[PDB]
Protein backbone atom coordinates (compact mmCIF):
# COMPACT_ATOMS: atom_id res chain seq x y z
CA UNK A 1 0.00 0.00 0.00
CA UNK A 2 1.45 3.34 -1.11
CA UNK A 3 3.56 5.49 1.18
CA UNK A 4 4.59 9.08 0.62
CA UNK A 5 7.34 9.73 -1.91
CA UNK A 6 10.88 9.29 -0.61
CA UNK A 7 14.36 9.86 -2.06
CA UNK A 8 15.23 7.09 -4.49
CA UNK A 9 11.68 6.47 -5.73
CA UNK A 10 11.59 6.09 -9.50
CA UNK A 11 8.92 7.98 -11.42
CA UNK A 12 7.78 9.43 -14.65
CA UNK A 13 7.57 13.18 -13.99
CA UNK A 14 5.29 15.43 -16.03
CA UNK A 15 6.38 18.94 -17.02
CA UNK A 16 4.46 21.36 -19.22
CA UNK A 17 5.48 20.90 -22.85
CA UNK A 18 7.31 17.62 -22.20
CA UNK A 19 6.18 13.99 -22.28
CA UNK A 20 6.14 12.09 -19.00
CA UNK A 21 9.84 11.80 -18.33
CA UNK A 22 11.91 9.11 -16.55
CA UNK A 23 13.06 10.61 -13.27
CA UNK A 24 13.85 9.95 -9.62
CA UNK A 25 13.14 11.62 -6.30
CA UNK A 26 16.51 13.07 -5.42
CA UNK A 27 18.21 13.34 -2.09
CA UNK A 28 19.07 16.82 -0.85
CA UNK A 29 22.79 17.09 -0.18
CA UNK A 30 24.07 18.80 2.94
CA UNK A 31 24.22 22.53 2.31
CA UNK A 32 22.28 22.20 -0.95
CA UNK A 33 19.21 24.23 -1.88
CA UNK A 34 16.00 22.72 -0.40
CA UNK A 35 12.73 22.47 -2.36
CA UNK A 36 9.67 24.59 -1.52
CA UNK A 37 7.19 23.04 0.93
CA UNK A 38 5.16 20.12 -0.47
CA UNK A 39 7.59 19.83 -3.40
CA UNK A 40 10.23 17.21 -4.19
CA UNK A 41 13.59 17.60 -5.95
CA UNK A 42 13.12 15.69 -9.21
CA UNK A 43 16.20 14.53 -11.09
CA UNK A 44 15.39 13.92 -14.76
CA UNK A 45 17.33 11.08 -16.35
CA UNK A 46 19.04 11.78 -19.66
CA UNK A 47 19.02 15.57 -19.39
CA UNK A 48 20.28 15.37 -15.77
CA UNK A 49 18.31 18.54 -14.97
CA UNK A 50 16.45 19.08 -11.70
CA UNK A 51 13.02 20.57 -11.09
CA UNK A 52 10.80 20.92 -8.02
CA UNK A 53 7.49 19.11 -8.42
CA UNK A 54 4.50 18.06 -6.36
CA UNK A 55 2.98 14.57 -6.38
CA UNK A 56 0.34 15.55 -8.95
CA UNK A 57 3.11 15.36 -11.57
CA UNK A 58 4.81 12.18 -10.27
CA UNK A 59 3.82 8.77 -11.66
CA UNK A 60 5.34 5.55 -10.24
CA UNK A 61 7.80 4.03 -12.68
CA UNK A 62 6.78 0.38 -12.33
CA UNK A 63 3.06 1.10 -12.70
CA UNK A 64 3.39 3.43 -15.71
CA UNK A 65 6.41 2.18 -17.66
CA UNK A 66 4.29 0.31 -20.21
CA UNK A 67 2.45 3.57 -20.93
CA UNK A 68 5.27 6.13 -20.72
CA UNK A 69 8.49 4.16 -21.24
CA UNK A 70 8.66 4.08 -25.03
CA UNK A 71 11.38 5.78 -27.09
CA UNK A 72 10.79 9.46 -27.81
CA UNK A 73 12.50 11.96 -30.08
CA UNK A 74 13.02 14.60 -27.37
CA UNK A 75 16.62 15.42 -26.49
CA UNK A 76 17.89 13.14 -23.73
CA UNK A 77 14.74 11.01 -23.44
CA UNK A 78 16.14 7.72 -24.74
CA UNK A 79 19.32 8.16 -22.73
CA UNK A 80 17.03 8.71 -19.74
CA UNK A 81 15.17 5.49 -20.49
CA UNK A 82 18.47 3.60 -20.29
CA UNK A 83 19.46 5.27 -17.03
CA UNK A 84 16.22 4.60 -15.18
CA UNK A 85 16.28 0.94 -16.24
CA UNK A 86 20.00 0.20 -15.85
CA UNK A 87 21.50 2.54 -13.24
CA UNK A 88 18.78 4.71 -11.67
CA UNK A 89 20.60 5.39 -8.38
CA UNK A 90 24.00 6.37 -9.76
CA UNK A 91 25.67 9.77 -9.51
CA UNK A 92 25.20 11.55 -12.85
CA UNK A 93 27.10 14.74 -11.97
BR1 LIG B 1 10.80 17.47 -18.37
C2 LIG B 1 12.67 17.49 -18.38
C3 LIG B 1 13.54 16.50 -18.82
N4 LIG B 1 14.81 16.85 -18.65
N5 LIG B 1 14.76 18.09 -18.09
C6 LIG B 1 13.49 18.53 -17.89
C7 LIG B 1 13.22 19.85 -17.27
C8 LIG B 1 12.75 20.91 -18.03
C9 LIG B 1 12.61 22.15 -17.42
N10 LIG B 1 12.90 22.39 -16.13
C11 LIG B 1 13.35 21.35 -15.42
C12 LIG B 1 13.53 20.08 -15.93
Q: Exposed, middle or buried: residue 79 (CB in 10 Å: 0-12, 13-18, 19+)? A: middle
**Contact yes or no for 58/42 (Cβ under 8 A):** yes
Q: Resolution limit in angstroms?
A: 1.7
* 11, 59 Cβ separation under 8 angstroms: yes
CATH number at residue 16: 2.30.30.140
Q: 19: domain range?
A: 2-93
Run of H or E including 42: strand 40-44
The domain tally of the chain equals 1
Using alpha carbons, select from 70, 54, 73, 59 the residue that is nearest to residue 23.
Answer: 59
15 Cβ below 6 A of ligand 1 = yes
* Integer Cα distance of 77 and 28 in angstroms: 24
With the most atoms of ligand 1 within 8 angstroms of its CB, the residue from 12, 26, 49 to mutate is 49
Q: Residue 26 C-alpha to ligand 1 middle, in angstroms? A: 14
Q: Are strands 40-44 and 58-60 parallel, antiparallel or unpaired?
A: unpaired
Amino acid sequence: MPHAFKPGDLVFAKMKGYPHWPARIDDIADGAVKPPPNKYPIFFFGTHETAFLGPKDLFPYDKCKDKYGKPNKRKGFNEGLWEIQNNPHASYS
